[PDB]
Amino acid sequence: VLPENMKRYMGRDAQRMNILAGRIIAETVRSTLGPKGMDKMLVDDLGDVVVTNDGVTILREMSVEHPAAKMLIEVAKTQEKEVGDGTTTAVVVAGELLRKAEELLDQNVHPTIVVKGYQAAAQKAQELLKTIACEVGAQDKEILTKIAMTSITGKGAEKAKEKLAEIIVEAVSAVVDDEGKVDKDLIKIEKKSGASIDDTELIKGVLVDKERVSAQMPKKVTDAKIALLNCAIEETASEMLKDMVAEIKASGANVLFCQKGIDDLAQHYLAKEGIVAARRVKKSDMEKLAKATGANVITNIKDLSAQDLGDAGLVEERKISGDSMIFVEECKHPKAVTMLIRGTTEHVIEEVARAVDDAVGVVGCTIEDGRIVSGGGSTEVELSMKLREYAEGISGREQLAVRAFADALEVIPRTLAENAGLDAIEILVKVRAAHASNGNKCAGLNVFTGAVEDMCENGVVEPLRVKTQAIQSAAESTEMLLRIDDVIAAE
Amino acid sequence: VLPENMKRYMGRDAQRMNILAGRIIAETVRSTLGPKGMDKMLVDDLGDVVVTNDGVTILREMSVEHPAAKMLIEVAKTQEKEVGDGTTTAVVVAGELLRKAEELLDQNVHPTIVVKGYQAAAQKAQELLKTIACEVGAQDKEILTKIAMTSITGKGAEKAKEKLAEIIVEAVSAVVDDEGKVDKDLIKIEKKSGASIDDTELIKGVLVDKERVSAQMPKKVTDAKIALLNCAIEETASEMLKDMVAEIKASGANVLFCQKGIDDLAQHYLAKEGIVAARRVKKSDMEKLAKATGANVITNIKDLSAQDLGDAGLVEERKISGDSMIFVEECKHPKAVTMLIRGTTEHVIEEVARAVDDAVGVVGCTIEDGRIVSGGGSTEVELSMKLREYAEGISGREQLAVRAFADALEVIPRTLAENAGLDAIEILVKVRAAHASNGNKCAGLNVFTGAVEDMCENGVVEPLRVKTQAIQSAAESTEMLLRIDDVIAAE
Amino acid sequence: VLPENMKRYMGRDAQRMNILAGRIIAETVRSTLGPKGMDKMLVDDLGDVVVTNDGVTILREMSVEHPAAKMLIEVAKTQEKEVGDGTTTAVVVAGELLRKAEELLDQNVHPTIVVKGYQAAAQKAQELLKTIACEVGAQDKEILTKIAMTSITGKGAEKAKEKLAEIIVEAVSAVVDDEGKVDKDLIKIEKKSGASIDDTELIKGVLVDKERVSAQMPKKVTDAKIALLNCAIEETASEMLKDMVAEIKASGANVLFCQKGIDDLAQHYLAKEGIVAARRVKKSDMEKLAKATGANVITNIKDLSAQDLGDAGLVEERKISGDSMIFVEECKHPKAVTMLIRGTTEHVIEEVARAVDDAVGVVGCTIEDGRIVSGGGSTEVELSMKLREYAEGISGREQLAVRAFADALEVIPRTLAENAGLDAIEILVKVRAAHASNGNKCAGLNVFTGAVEDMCENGVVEPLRVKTQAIQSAAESTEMLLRIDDVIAAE
Amino acid sequence: VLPENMKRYMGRDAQRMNILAGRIIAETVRSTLGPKGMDKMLVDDLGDVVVTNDGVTILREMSVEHPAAKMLIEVAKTQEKEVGDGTTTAVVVAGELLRKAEELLDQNVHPTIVVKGYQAAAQKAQELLKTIACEVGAQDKEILTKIAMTSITGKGAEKAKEKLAEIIVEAVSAVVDDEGKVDKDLIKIEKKSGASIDDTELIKGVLVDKERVSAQMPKKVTDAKIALLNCAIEETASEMLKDMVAEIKASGANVLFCQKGIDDLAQHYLAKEGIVAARRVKKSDMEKLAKATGANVITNIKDLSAQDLGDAGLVEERKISGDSMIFVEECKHPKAVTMLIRGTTEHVIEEVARAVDDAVGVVGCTIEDGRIVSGGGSTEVELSMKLREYAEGISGREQLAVRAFADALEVIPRTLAENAGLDAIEILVKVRAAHASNGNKCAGLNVFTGAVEDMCENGVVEPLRVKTQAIQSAAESTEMLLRIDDVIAAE
Numbered sequence A, B, C, D: 001v002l003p004e005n006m007k008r009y010m011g012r013d014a015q016r017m018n019i020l021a022g023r024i025i026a027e028t029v030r031s032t033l034g035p036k037g038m039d040k041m042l043v044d045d046l047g048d049v050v051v052t053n054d055g056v057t058i059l060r061e062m063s064v065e066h067p068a069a070k071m072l073i074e075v076a077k078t079q080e081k082e083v084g085d086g087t088t089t090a091v092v093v094a095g096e097l098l099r100k101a102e103e104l105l106d107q108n109v110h111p112t113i114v115v116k117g118y119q120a121a122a123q124k125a126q127e128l129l130k131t132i133a134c135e136v137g138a139q140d141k142e143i144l145t146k147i148a149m150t151s152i153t154g155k156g157a158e159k160a161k162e163k164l165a166e167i168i169v170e171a172v173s174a175v176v177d178d179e180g181k182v183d184k185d186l187i188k189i190e191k192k193s194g195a196s197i198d199d200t201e202l203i204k205g206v207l208v209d210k211e212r213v214s215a216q217m218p219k220k221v222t223d224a225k226i227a228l229l230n231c232a233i234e235e236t237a238s239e240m241l242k243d244m245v246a247e248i249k250a251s252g253a254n255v256l257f258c259q260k261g262i263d264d265l266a267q268h269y270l271a272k273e274g275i276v277a278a279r280r281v282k283k284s285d286m287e288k289l290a291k292a293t294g295a296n297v298i299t300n301i302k303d304l305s306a307q308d309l310g311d312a313g314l315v316e317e318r319k320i321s322g323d324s325m326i327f328v329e330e331c332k333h334p335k336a337v338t339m340l341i342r343g344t345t346e347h348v349i350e351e352v353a354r355a356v357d358d359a360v361g362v363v364g365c366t367i368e369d370g371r372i373v374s375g376g377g378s379t380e381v382e383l384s385m386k387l388r389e390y391a392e393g394i395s396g397r398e399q400l401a402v403r404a405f406a407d408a409l410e411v412i413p414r415t416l417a418e419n420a421g422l423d424a425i426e427i428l429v430k431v432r433a434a435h436a437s438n439g440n441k442c443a444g445l446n447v448f449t450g451a452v453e454d455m456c457e458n459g460v461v462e463p464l465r466v467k468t469q470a471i472q473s474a475a476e477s478t479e480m481l482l483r484i485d486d487v488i489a490a491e
Helices: A012-032 A055-061 A067-082 A087-106 A111-132 A141-152 A156-176 A238-250 A264-272 A283-293 A346-368 A378-394 A398-408 A411-418 A424-438 A464-481 B012-032 B055-061 B067-082 B087-106 B111-132 B141-152 B156-176 B238-250 B264-272 B283-293 B346-368 B378-394 B398-408 B411-418 B424-438 B464-481 C012-032 C055-061 C067-082 C087-106 C111-132 C141-152 C156-176 C238-250 C264-272 C283-293 C346-368 C378-394 C398-408 C411-418 C424-438 C464-481 D012-032 D055-061 D067-082 D087-106 D111-132 D141-152 D156-176 D238-250 D264-272 D283-293 D346-368 D378-394 D398-408 D411-418 D424-438 D464-481
Strands: A039-043 A049-052 A187-191 A201-203 A205-208 A220-229 A255-258 A276-278 A310-320 A323-329 A337-341 A371-374 A461-463 B039-043 B049-052 B187-191 B201-203 B205-208 B220-229 B255-258 B276-278 B310-320 B323-329 B337-341 B371-374 B461-463 B484-489 C039-043 C049-052 C187-191 C201-203 C205-208 C220-229 C255-258 C276-278 C310-320 C323-329 C337-341 C371-374 C461-463 C484-489 D040-043 D049-052 D187-191 D201-203 D205-208 D220-229 D255-258 D276-278 D310-320 D323-329 D337-341 D371-374 D461-463 D484-489
Touching: A012 A039, A012 A055, A012 A067, A012 A087, A012 A411, A012 A464, A012 B484, A039 A055, A039 B067, A049 A055, A049 A346, A049 B067, A055 A067, A055 A087, A055 B484, A067 A087, A067 A464, A087 A111, A087 A398, A087 A411, A087 A464, A111 A371, A111 A378, A111 A398, A111 A464, A141 A156, A141 A346, A141 A461, A156 A187, A156 A201, A156 A337, A156 A346, A187 A205, A187 A346, A201 A205, A205 A283, A220 A283, A238 A264, A255 A283, A264 A276, A283 A310, A283 A323, A337 A346, A346 A461, A346 A464, A346 B067, A346 B464, A371 A378, A371 A464, A378 A398, A378 A411, A378 A424, A411 A424, A461 A464, B012 B039, B012 B055, B012 B067, B012 B087, B012 B411, B012 B464, B012 B484, B012 C484, B039 B055, B039 C067, B049 B055, B049 B346, B049 C067, B055 B067, B055 B087, B055 C484, B067 B087, B067 B464, B067 B484, B087 B111, B087 B398, B087 B411, B087 B464, B111 B371, B111 B378, B111 B398, B111 B464, B141 B156, B141 B346, B141 B461, B156 B187, B156 B201, B156 B337, B156 B346, B187 B205, B187 B346, B201 B205, B205 B283, B220 B283, B238 B264, B255 B283, B264 B276, B283 B310, B283 B323, B337 B346, B346 B461, B346 B464, B346 C067, B346 C464, B371 B378, B371 B464, B378 B398, B378 B411, B378 B424, B411 B424, B461 B464, C012 C039, C012 C055, C012 C067, C012 C087, C012 C411, C012 C464, C012 C484, C012 D484, C039 C055, C039 D067, C049 C055, C049 C346, C049 D067, C055 C067, C055 C087, C055 D484, C067 C087, C067 C464, C067 C484, C087 C111, C087 C398, C087 C411, C087 C464, C111 C371, C111 C378, C111 C398, C111 C464, C141 C156, C141 C346, C141 C461, C156 C187, C156 C201, C156 C337, C156 C346, C187 C205, C187 C346, C201 C205, C205 C283, C220 C283, C238 C264, C255 C283, C264 C276, C283 C310, C283 C323, C337 C346, C346 C461, C346 C464, C346 D067, C346 D464, C371 C378, C371 C464, C378 C398, C378 C411, C378 C424, C411 C424, C461 C464, D012 D055, D012 D067, D012 D087, D012 D411, D012 D464, D012 D484, D040 D055, D049 D055, D049 D346, D055 D067, D055 D087, D067 D087, D067 D464, D067 D484, D087 D111, D087 D398, D087 D411, D087 D464, D111 D371, D111 D378, D111 D398, D111 D464, D141 D156, D141 D346, D141 D461, D156 D187, D156 D201, D156 D337, D156 D346, D187 D205, D187 D346, D201 D205, D205 D283, D220 D283, D238 D264, D255 D283, D264 D276, D283 D310, D283 D323, D337 D346, D346 D461, D346 D464, D371 D378, D371 D464, D378 D398, D378 D411, D378 D424, D411 D424, D461 D464
Parallel strands: A039 B484, A187 A337, A205 A337, A220 A255, A255 A276, B039 C484, B187 B337, B205 B337, B220 B255, B255 B276, C039 D484, C187 C337, C205 C337, C220 C255, C255 C276, D187 D337, D205 D337, D220 D255, D255 D276
Antiparallel strands: A039 A049, A201 A337, A205 A323, A220 A310, A310 A323, A371 A461, B039 B049, B201 B337, B205 B323, B220 B310, B310 B323, B371 B461, C039 C049, C201 C337, C205 C323, C220 C310, C310 C323, C371 C461, D040 D049, D201 D337, D205 D323, D220 D310, D310 D323, D371 D461
């Protein structure tokens, strides 16, 4: 019935091999954990080399084969989609939970138990995070900038996390409008090597990596009237093509972003009418311009009217490190912003782009959910301390599964020190004792000095959503996988 | 999970293999370093043989496989894009920094440290360059010609660096206009074997490697009226094609540069109207002509008008070593110049072209940033001397990483003498002592006499930007790579 | 990083292998050297067999692989382009310079030295040639015919060098017009086996290897009116095609050279109008006819007018060894000439064609540069004698490199006797002593009697440009290659 | 540098291998030499089997690989083109000259010598042939028929050389017109098996291997009016096609030779108009008909007029051995003739065709050059006898090369007897002595009786041009090849 060459294991052998696949992913990504966490270098299918610490990025790009190892990718994806940061935290916990669950299966604790106890400990772990969760101002600059900075840490970009946090919190506050719902789509991440990271800046409008299609065209437009065309400006015959150009002018348009192409003839006449134009504009960028300037994306040029034009105070072609770009700035009421990233090298600003991708996310999460928790592994410590006592209260077979859950949660404290160059064993003893004695806001690992400290006092904080979604995805993926005792792959 | 055939190392083994890849590049390119540095012979994918010393050129063309060895290519690319010269300096420092960092990892200094100490030493190294940096006249002929000459040295072209420096500084000053922003794009590098390098000259206008499309056409135009066409002059039927030719004449045009083709029929009639014409004109050259003559690149010939024509005092077809070229000279207010390079052989003028590509760049860098530093490894000596003391002040684990940084910086002094045929060990002892005693402007290696001298006194100087960008790219690439403990390549 | 299968050597091993490649070329081509030099037989990609002594021809056609061996090809190409003759002299010197440079590297003289000393000796070698250079009449028949003859020697064609020199000097003087600039393009080399080399003749006009397209056409035209058409005379329908023919007649044309085809119908009607016509005329030959007759190459037949016709006293179809050709002779003021070569066999007249290709070149070089030097290795002897003393004056490490340069220059004297069947060792001792005692114009090798003689007295002379460009290309290529310590070839 | 698999030899090894290649050709073709020489059987790429003695034919068709062996093919080609006969004589002498030259190189005589001495002996050998050359009547029947017959001998066709000589001398005299220039192109060689060689005949006009395209057409035309069409008589629609036919009749044409096709409809109507027609007429045969009848080859049928028609007294379709052919005979003033060859078999008449191809050539050579020399190896004997004495007079190294030249020339006497079944050694001693004593016209080999005789007395004579071109091509090819010391073949 079964193809020869495929491998099939049963009982503890099915569970050992399949679980181990997930454990491998955790042992890989655990190196990125923490404010003093390390980085990875990933090379895509084109040869392009990426320097990043983002766990979801690592798992998405890398080539995993086994379904169970692929499930931790799903954990990373839900963490990215909902939170942005904590993607490694979610995976490594899920893998460690799998690791301890396999040791538990090895001790001959029936799969019916490990599923139950892990479910119990995970349901309590969620309550515990919500229990210690401290209410903060949704739009409070200070706590938002502390989120932003701690998000950036553990990445190559942390060298200048302070300048980044400022423009990232302002970027979110700019586009969010009301209080609130934050959508990371309205905050564009542009990067161009040159200068330092301190030179990174926020542009109140839309910045596109486009150029003025003709040398004769104006390089600067004031009190700009922006038109958004999606139909290519390409017409057989000079009369018909110039008609299209004339209609743009007739609507009062002075700036023209075309999603498709612009014929050389149209570029020429456009220059004569004092209209600045860019071709091959990203469809997404067309929508950013519509939101920012209030410009209307129109299909037929015949349909373009003055009512379809958006406003921007300045539309100007500027060179950054030689490469020309178009800044659409000083919009009346923009709903989209762009952050142009600077840095010493292309690979550095790639990491900065990943640092701000996470940071700008989690800044939004706290504006939506006005609860925050202490970072530096402080939560996970609180979770292990209580869930160990929980295990004792539950008793029976379930206590071993809850003990395995709680012990697995210490992978974060454990690796926060490990890759920070601190002794994992010694630190965890000092931290766990420090928590039980000093309290909840008075513990966790300070990987920056390499000792137990007060995470909350030192502004080492992460949104509640980070840690809640991390536990949810991580623990639910484990408790789900613990039910699976058969893997069937189609040919 | 992982493909069999791919190799994966962990801990000190991941770092050893990956770092070594970068170290190989440095050991290769270090041979080009210095005013008495050596050259390389690179053969492209077509069979063409290139003689060059340009580090970025070596790394761009050669076929590197490993990502880490590719990062030093990125270091060379940012050095080229921003500076022009010092591309080998940036790579070899980055590789040596990697070399000493690996020795440091071998001594069991946690990756969390090597990243920190290198960051500290690099941040100080930048300040130190800015600290010793001497303010000079942005447009000062003398200091600009000293930059130009020292840039040319270490290359086959140094035999005539004096004649080259003159036309290179004048080339920059010509196109820069105001004080200032220098763009290397407005200075064209043409090369044609014949005569010597002394015969190399600057043409105040645009020189293109084009010919007069018909034998009947004038070979010389005075008080020329230049038209720039982008649409090919090719029309079915004689009446329609001659109409296009008639319109060119009607606009008052006497010179015609077509980016595309010119039909044989149009060439014939053009000759009858006394219009000189060239086909297949480089699109870039069309823009050079527009900037120089003030000619307007027009799409439709119907649109060509007298207002679109540019002016040049002389447009003439001249043979250099038999091959005919078109000189567009004596423009009113040209924004573009061309330097025609002469020399004993095609491969020699290829090196001269690379020598002036670097020289014309760094001449511009000093006009933009009015600070200059002494060359001949004098800076790197200043850096090692201070950063060693810095290491002692810092203490702890960081001091070893800073000591490795400072010691690695001596690769420049070290190889400046090595490939100059001087004893690296003896010279470095005499130079480093000479710096500490005599001062900052009173040291460095004089590879020309093969002894410690006064680099600043002898006019052995390089722009601050050269050395600052060299350290920035080199040290930041190292400190970045030191964070990476996992390489994942897609299939 | 590096492909397995590719070979990489370092230090003295990189230099040994790479230099040797160039040395191989020199050891090959040295057999052609001298007035009594030998020949080579080269077979192209089509099977065609060529008998030649031309060094550039040998190197261009043969299949060299190594870049360094390819550089000597570039040396041969610049010698051909600028001079014509001396192409083997330039390569063999470059190779010998490489040979002695490798022996010098083997003795552990740092590459920084060999580059310097060779540069010094080469710069002096140029001055020395200019120093002994004797001023002669630019258009002087006698000295021009001595150049021509000595150029022809060392080739199969030397048997009749006297008849060849006459028509070659007259060929140059004919087309050069003013004093002067000589372009070898205006002197066509035609060859057809039959008779002897003495029967070779110069045609004051243009000789093309074309035939009268119709049997009915006149075979001879007197006071000819020549039209030059580039558009094929091929038109659907008899009325439209005969119109084209009628217009040719209408312009007054009696001779018609079409660059493209001629329709059978047009050939028929052309014969009825007494118009002689040839199809598939080489585009280059169309330009020769334009220059000679003053005929205008016209595109559209509609555009052909009487003003476009050129004049020739005689246009006639003549058979030489059966094959018919068209002679366009007795032009008013021709700027182009053709030399029809005769000889006992096709392979013999191929060598004669190569002998006159070189001879007609170097005759022009002396008209442009009115300085000449004694041949038969007399210069190279003068160079070795002085540069040995120069080496002693320079001292230090450089003296060994200058000694190697000067000794390498003796490859010409050395092989002039070697392949002449004279003892290289004995002759060189007698010649070098004879120079030092008797003077500069009183030495060199007379390979014709096989003894030291007076080269200048015996009319064994070559243009200064021959020897200057030979040293320039040869020595500069060496001094360039001596800088290269890395060869990187793309896949 | 050099491809592995290719072979390269130097010095005496390069010369041994390369020369031997040529020597092989001579040893092959020497079997055809002499009036009693033998034949070869060559099979082409189609399977067709050819019986011939023609040396040029043997070398052209056979597949030679080595360049040096290919040079003897060039010797055969120039001998054929200029002379016709003596093609084996030229090659075998060239090969033997190479053979003795290799023995001379083996004795360590420098290549500089062998080239000189062979040149000297060859230049004298030419004078010697011209010296003994006897003036004869250019158009003298008798001496022309003796040339013709001796040309035919050594071939299968010699059985009937007397009948052949008559029509071959008459064929030349017929077409030559004035005295004179003979072109073998105006004498066509047709062959058709049947009857004997005695039945071979000359047709005063043109004989083509064509048939009457329709069964209804006349088989015989008297006082014929011949039209020469090159455009195919093929037209859509019956009216348009019959118009073409009507115009032929309208011009007065009764005979129609079409170079291209004739439509079945046109053949039908042509038969109704009493016009005889043949399609697919060879383009060359169209020109033969134009020359013979004075008919004009016309392109457009519209252009055909009565003035374009040629005259022939008789145009008739005749069957020879069943196969029908068209005889165009009794022309007013024909410039072309055809000789229809008969013989017992197709392969026999193929040899007869080759016998008359040579004979008709050399008959012409004597009409152009009114000097003749005795055959049967008498010349070559005269050459050896004098050049041996010449060798002694010259002395030095050259005497050995001249001795080798003179001795090699005896290959003709040597093989004339060898393949005639006579002792080469004995005959050569008797002949060479007989020459020295009896004189120049009183010697040579009579292979017919197999003894020394008087060649001139017995009418065993060949044109001077035969022997002069044989020596020229043979000796000059040797003296050329002796200069070559390197063979370079492209891939």
